[PDB]
From a paper:
There, 10–30% of total Cbls are bound to transcobalamin (TC). Cellular uptake of Cbls occurs via receptor-mediated endocytosis of holo-TC by means of the receptor CD320. TC consist of two domains (alpha and beta) that are connected by a flexible linker. Both domains contribute to Cbl binding, resulting in sub-pico-molar affinity.
To address the question of how Cbl mediated TC assembly proceeds, we determined crystal structures of apo TC-beta and TC-beta in complex with Cbl, putatively representing the first steps of TC assembly. We expressed the two domains of TC individually in insect cells, which lowered the affinity for Cbls while retaining the structural integrity of the domains, as no denaturing was required to generate the Cbl-free domains. After proteolytic cleavage of the MBP and further affinity purification we obtained pure, substrate free TC-beta. We next determined the crystal structure of apo TC-beta at 1.57 Å resolution, which represents to our knowledge the first structure of TC resembling a putative partial apo state of TC in the apo form (i.e. TC-alpha and TC-beta are not associated with each other). The structure was highly similar to the Cbl bound state of TC-beta (rmsd = 0.41 Å for 97 Cα-atoms), with minor changes evident in several side chains compared to CNCbl-bound TC-beta. The structures of apo TC-beta and CNCbl-bound TC-beta provide insight into distinct states of holo-TC assembly. They demonstrate the structural integrity of apo TC-beta and Cbl-bound TC-beta and therefore further consolidate the hypothesized mechanism of Cbl dependent holo-TC assembly. Virtually no structural changes occur in TC-beta upon Cbl binding, arguing against an induced fit mechanism with regards to this domain of TC. Lastly, we demonstrated that the production of apo TC-beta is a robust method to probe the interaction of TC with alternative substrates, as it is easy to produce and to co-crystallize with various substrates.
Residue numbers in the entry: 305 to 409
Write the structure that this text describes.
Amino acid sequence: HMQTQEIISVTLQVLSLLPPYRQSISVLAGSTVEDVLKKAHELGGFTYETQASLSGPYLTSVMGKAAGEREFWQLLRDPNTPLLQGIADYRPKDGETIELRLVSW
């Protein structure tokens, strides 16, 4: 009995930093954003940190830049669409661009 999975490509981008980060990342369909970040780190040149919360992990640092007071790393889908899901819940689609943006409130 055969079994199959699709390999998709997700573009990960961070424009809140100089220099900006932008890379195409290959993962299996069904991977979460957190799986994309893990693969980006394995490829080299991407780092991040997460912390636990009652609703799952969330980003506290991206490419060495920690969110400060009244700031957080926001997850968006290109062009400018906030995703109201955590990194461990959102499952990107083939060809999607995922952006991490440091925002203050």
